[model samples]
Target: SLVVPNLMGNKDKADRQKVMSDLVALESTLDMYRLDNNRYPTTEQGLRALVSKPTVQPEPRNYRQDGYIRRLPQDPWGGDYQLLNPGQYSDIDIFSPGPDGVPNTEDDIGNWTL
Candidate 1:
């Protein structure tokens, strides 16, 4: 399951690696989604849109791909991606809220494309 950064759970190499692989899938899915939608997804949309159709439609456009990315990942701490633009430390950021599952607390890990 996915949680918000502030509610992340579980912290292990196997788990972290699982999240890494999932994030990689998200990267590919987002790239494809952008190609189809003409814009990047907002953080509010989250990766749920990638694995399935969103519960609430954002616009008239459809952003689904047949099967480009198989699965989604949980954050290193079993939480959802930060999904925030102008994210914590970058123009765009991908991150885990850390073992504490509390945003900006004890072990937050971030990704800023580089």
Candidate 2:
């Protein structure tokens, strides 16, 4: 006889892990940007600065012509990842709102806590 057991719910855990992994990847990319520009982009510039040259003040003089990542990735939950320049937790903060899709909540996932 064939019997099917109820599936355990671990999707959130997997998603959190994925979010953490994405944050690390973004952190590394930001480090490379800093190595060339000597500073992280301003909050106004945001993570888009990684994919394209910033037209705002304090422009990067050595921004890679090809850009950093091929393209910015949305969080697994379908929300854009965010960056905080002059981060409260570090020089820069990269984070996702987590499953709740809300920022500044206990469920938020950020590089600082990693």
Candidate 3:
């Protein structure tokens, strides 16, 4: 069984809101990651850096010896949440692929949608 909450839902804006809420909730952890490391994880590091110490470029000097999130949440569509730094939508981009499971489209929900 997946440890992350099953907030998964389809197309409705309400569904999008559910995912947005989660992303914002998780952003707190990302902020923690950023504050301690002095920058957000690289796009290559992605969100997994929170739960697993990143073994990529710009490795965290103060990464949690254990982990940040116990697990990474899935988008409402059961897709992996997209994580980016220096995002097209914001300084950090955290979004769901939306119901269509396709990203960078109108249905994608994130900091930009709220």
Question: Which consecutive 10 residues in model 1 have the weakest lDDT in total?
Answer: 6-15
Steric clashes per prediction = 1, 0, 0
1-114: candidate 3 lDDT, tens digit per residue: 767654433336577677978898778999888888888889999989999898888978988788788999888679888887888877789888877888677767787766
Candidate 1 on 1-114: residue-level lDDT in tens?
A: 975664334346566666566556666667787677765556666655666655664641755545335666667557766666445664346667767887665566665433
- Clashing residue pairs found in predicted model 2: none
- Residues 1-108 of candidate 2: C-alpha lDDT, one tens digit per residue: 986653434676687788888998899999999999999999989899999999898989899998888888888888888988899989998899877888778878
Leading candidate by TM-score: 2
Per-residue lDDT of 89 in model 1: 64
Give the Cα lDDT of each candidate: 0.61, 0.87, 0.82
Regions of model 3 farther than 4 Å from truth: 1-11
- Residue 43, candidate 1: Cα error in Å is 1.9
Compared to the true structure, candidate 3 yields what TM-score?
0.83
TM-score of each: 0.62, 0.86, 0.83
Error of 1 at 103 (Å): 3.0
Better candidate number, 1 or 2, judged by TM-score: 2
